């Protein structure tokens, strides 16, 4: 069919659209769904619906848009009844399963990672079959959430360990089948002798690091920090031309620093003959977060240093 | 090589093996490791139990421990014992007696921790049963003529009456006299252990295990070592614990007790690397980056490198950054002590033989590693897998309170809208006449003002009704609720 | 059956795809607007 139109909605029908682009987002969501196997497209805001009517002429498909209609009831559509499950799923880092198993859609900086967690039932039975069963359910949910969360790239998975190689292969085949309905660039691979699974990409097209720890999942322990910062300070203390030492740290830190370890601090003053040491607990600073500056009242410098940093 | 030991503060025990001025092996002691297993101890029976036929004993504060009846030695039993099934612990001993005991089962249950009267001694070549004579013979791995001739060598050696011995699995057995040496050394240590315990009746720790010495010498130390450094001379003699007690005094030369006016680690200027061991991303040694993160399902690393934006550089230079990296990968590897699932994102290159080359650089580092490592070829996508079993089988603030492990911030606006829709879904629910809720203040700050009439609509619909920490309770003053 | 409902794509019963509006969009230069070492393409890093 393409061959005949090459010389040439018909090409005549195509010509009208070509004028605008040659002469020259939410409607682009309509361009994302060119399949248009959808009949019901209901809008609660009539102004948006009238904008859709303006976009029905630009879309140039009134016959496809015949079923489009603003609708009061989201619940009958499930827009206000069923959809909401997935609605918050797209931000659930972990997804339960109808089988009860679950996944952990991780966001490692180097690459995307997901392990699948079996339904941790009260007892264990036929754990191997359970693995494949849960695995199959998982695989199904995989592509769904994958597209839905809109993340792809260097994806890898770690399944529940699957001994029967042929059955593992069947699982892989299920994966191949998973995305047949999807329209995106995909390239699956085979299991890992480890048990990992290299996966495909989704780069076709809302958050930031957490306030505490600057996006690091964990936090180093205070007792660990009691010695770390101390070493830092003594290190900078030996810096030449240094007159005094400024230290910024949150309260629970300086607490166990000075009162609990006063001796070393004073010993640090005796070894570092002649260079002053100041330590400033600050409520605003986070548990790992702090600063330091060796070049104001002992209880009133942090304002100045804060105006600095 | 060069060995670095810092014990200025007894809390943190930082010890390291640095080639030249750069640290290689890592054993920073984590206080709270609490490897109480096999630690000689004192105390007094807390609760003789006829029903459990066992006696609680207060070694320490947490629990009163456990003592199976059968484990008890002659010293606990009275001079006039009787055999009637001997189930009677009250007949064996009245509680409160001073005790000799080693950690046996790491408390890992609400049930007590377990302890045994029959103590044991951990010798490099040998193991002594100071009291129980029954135990004896040779471990599995050593067999054959070794088993035959070693059984001749141990038979030639003489042990105190009533003392059993288990030759460690490292049964070279080449020097019967070496067996004699280390044994006797343990014998004097065992004699020194009970005497010192006779100091006082209170509960106290007679002996224990610490990477400071048990792991520092048997595992970390090698004959290749050229320098031995010690900061706290207080434990210099604690180092002489082994200087020759290991049976190889040749390190007497090695001992070089630190006496400089500079902290020993900076004296070799290693703290840069040391911090790298925790700093999330490490600048590549030649130049670039090697970024590490743990999925907690796996662990992944990436090597965005060359530290540039626009310049003249080539794929064989990026391939050059991949070879130089491989080592630093291994370094960081052994250092932060990873074990499990490890995957890379090597920047790929056209030269396939370069791929073979880089993996070859990786495998060479894997061979000199103490651990056991499985390796795999690169991926077609390039993600190369690798699994190294943890050498150290040892909630360390795993999730920050705001981060929750995710380290990711739900946008304030998104946070608001989720809450609003949840509210509406709650209002329409049967038996709803109010929607009280807890919400981060900053969200509320920009929330209502933009959504005055929106909330008005929310109210009209169902008439009659930090970022992670939001919890809305439906009702079938704000500042006090 | 398929229903479109923030933007929602319901395929039959389950939700086949999702689409949300956030400030800005993934548009190439002059999508909806208008060997030198440094140039002004809206920036100079590239």
């Amino acid at each position: 069919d393409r061959t005949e139109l090459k010389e040439a909605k018909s090409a005549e029908a195509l010509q009208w659209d070509l004028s605008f682009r040659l002469k020259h987002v939410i409607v682009r969501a309509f361009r994302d769904y060119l399949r248009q196997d959808i009949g019901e497209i209901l809008i609660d805001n009539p102004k948006v619906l009238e904008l859709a009517r303006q976009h029905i002429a630009a879309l140039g498909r009134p016959d496809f848009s015949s079923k489009i209609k603003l609708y009061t009831g989201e619940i009958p559509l499930f827009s206000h009844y069923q959809i909401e499950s997935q609605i918050e799923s797209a931000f659930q880092r972990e997804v339960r399963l109808p089988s009860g198993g679950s996944i952990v859609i991780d966001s490692t900086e180097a690459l995307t990672a997901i392990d699948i967690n079996s339904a941790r039932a009260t007892r264990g039975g036929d754990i191997e079959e359970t693995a494949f069963n849960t695995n199959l359910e998982a695989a199904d949910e995989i592509a769904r959430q994958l597209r839905l969360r809109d993340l792809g790239g260097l994806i890898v998975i770690c399944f529940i360990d699957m001994t029967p190689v042929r059955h593992q292969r069947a699982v892989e085949n299920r994966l191949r089948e998973a995305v047949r309905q999807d329209r995106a660039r995909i390239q699956i691979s085979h299991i890992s002798r480890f048990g990992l699974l290299e996966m495909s990409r989704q780069r076709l097209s809302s958050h930031h690091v957490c306030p505490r720890c600057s996006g690091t999942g964990t936090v180093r322990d205070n007792e660990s920090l009691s010695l770390s910062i101390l070493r830092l300070i003594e290190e900078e203390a030996l810096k030449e031309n240094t007159q005094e030492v400024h230290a910024i740290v949150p309260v629970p830190i300086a607490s166990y620093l000075l009162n609990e370890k006063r001796s070393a601090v004073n010993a640090i003053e005796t070894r570092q003959d002649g260079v002053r040491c100041v330590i400033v607990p600050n409520d605003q600073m986070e548990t790992p977060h702090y600063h330091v500056l060796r070049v104001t009242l002992s209880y009133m410098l942090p304002k100045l240093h804060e105006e600095a940093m | 090589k060069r060995m670095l030991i810092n014990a200025t503060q007894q809390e943190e025990l930082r010890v390291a093996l640095v080639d030249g001025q750069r640290l290689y092996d890592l054993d920073i002691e984590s206080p709270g490791h609490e490897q109480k297993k096999a630690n000689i101890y004192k105390g007094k029976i807390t609760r003789i139990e006829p029903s459990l036929e066992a006696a609680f004993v207060d070694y320490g504060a947490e629990r009163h421990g456990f003592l199976p009846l059968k484990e008890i030695a002659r010293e606990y039993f009275p001079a006039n014992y009787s055999a009637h099934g001997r189930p009677n612990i009250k007949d064996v001993l009245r509680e409160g007696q001073e005790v000799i005991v080693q950690i046996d089962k790491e408390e890992r249950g609400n049930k007590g921790a377990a302890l045994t009267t029959f103590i044991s001694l951990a010798g490099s070549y040998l193991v002594l049963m100071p009291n129980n004579p029954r135990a004896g013979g040779i471990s599995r791995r050593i067999e054959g003529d070794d088993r035959t001739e070693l059984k001749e060598a141990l038979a030639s050696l003489e042990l105190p009456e009533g003392m059993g011995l288990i030759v460690r699995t490292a049964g070279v057995g080449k020097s019967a006299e070496a067996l004699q040496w280390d044994l006797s050394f343990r014998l004097k240590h065992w004699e020194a252990i009970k005497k010192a315990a006779e100091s006082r009746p209170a509960p106290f720790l007679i002996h224990q295990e610490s990477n400071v010495i048990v792991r520092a010498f048997r595992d970390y130390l090698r004959q290749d070592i050229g320098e031995i450094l010690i900061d706290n001379p207080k434990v210099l003699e604690l180092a002489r614990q082994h200087i020759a007690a290991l049976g190889r005094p040749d390190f007497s030369s090695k001992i070089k007790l630190y006496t400089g006016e500079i902290p020993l680690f900076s004296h070799y200027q290693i703290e840069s690397q040391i911090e790298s061991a925790f700093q999330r991303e490490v600048r590549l040694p030649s130049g670039g980056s090697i970024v590490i993160d743990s999925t907690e399902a796996l662990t992944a690393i990436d090597i965005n490198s060359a530290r540039a934006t626009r310049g003249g550089d080539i794929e064989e230079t990026a391939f050059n950054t991949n070879l130089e990296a491989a080592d630093e990968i291994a370094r960081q590897l052994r250092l932060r002590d990873l074990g499990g699932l490890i995957v890379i994102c090597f920047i790929d290159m056209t030269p396939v033989r370069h791929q073979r080359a880089v993996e070859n650089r990786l495998r060479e580092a894997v061979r000199q590693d103490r651990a056991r490592i499985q390796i795999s070829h690169i991926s077609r996508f390039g993600l190369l897998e690798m699994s190294r079993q943890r050498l150290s089988p040892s909630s360390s603030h795993h999730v920050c309170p705001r981060c929750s492990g995710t380290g990711t911030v739900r946008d304030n606006e998104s946070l608001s809208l989720s809450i609003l829709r949840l509210i509406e879904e709650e209002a329409l629910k049967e038996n709803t006449q109010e929607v009280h809720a807890i919400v981060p203040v900053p969200i509320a700050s920009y929330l209502l003002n933009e959504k005055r009439s929106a909330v008005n609509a929310i109210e009209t619909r169902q008439d009659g009704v930090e970022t992670p920490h939001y919890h809305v309770l439906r009702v079938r003053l704000s500042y006090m609720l | 059956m398929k229903r479109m409902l923030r933007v929602a794509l319901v395929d039959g019963q389950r939700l086949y795809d999702l689409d949300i509006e956030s400030p800005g969009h993934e548009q190439k230069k002059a999508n909806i607007y208008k060997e030198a070492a440094f140039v002004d393409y809206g920036a100079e890093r590239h």
Binding site: R123, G124, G125, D126, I127, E129, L136, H167 | - | -
Partner: protein
Amino acid sequence: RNMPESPEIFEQAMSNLPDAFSPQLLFLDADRNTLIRRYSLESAIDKESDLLEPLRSRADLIVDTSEMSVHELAEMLRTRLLGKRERELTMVFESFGFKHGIPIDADYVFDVRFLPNPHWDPKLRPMTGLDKPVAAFLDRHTEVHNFIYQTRSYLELWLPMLETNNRSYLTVAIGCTGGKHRSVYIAEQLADYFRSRGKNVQSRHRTLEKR
């Protein structure tokens, strides 16, 4: 082949059957190509499906066997007909080595010292029970098959009672001296039979799992 031209007769005689034997109908479906893997090739099936359609209408149960498997079918059947008991076994087959000791927990155990020893051929000594060389080597010697059978029969006979009373585990442990060659093979095959019968199963080669 058994499909009548006029199914009115089918249901008529289906009426004829005596009451005591309750009839039930199961229908099956899978992907067209899925069926090809187990197996013109589109139209044969299409017209035949028209022939079969009355049954699917009359089907008591219809299953989608596209991703099916013997165990899937067996369990599906067990619940389909025998009904579901929350009481359920989980047989655990362990292969232990009498050197190391009888498993601390074990309901039944069987010594398999008499059966032919792969040990005799030296090329076999290293290889373990799950290396097809030895698997073959046994498979030939009949006595092995003889034992595998008789044992499977013994268990099968005493398996129902044990189902009663809601036992949560039943462990059978099979022991060679070393527990690498014979016991392993027997544990594996002997498991697979019971797997086929659809009861839940779990293998454990205790000696190999040491390292």
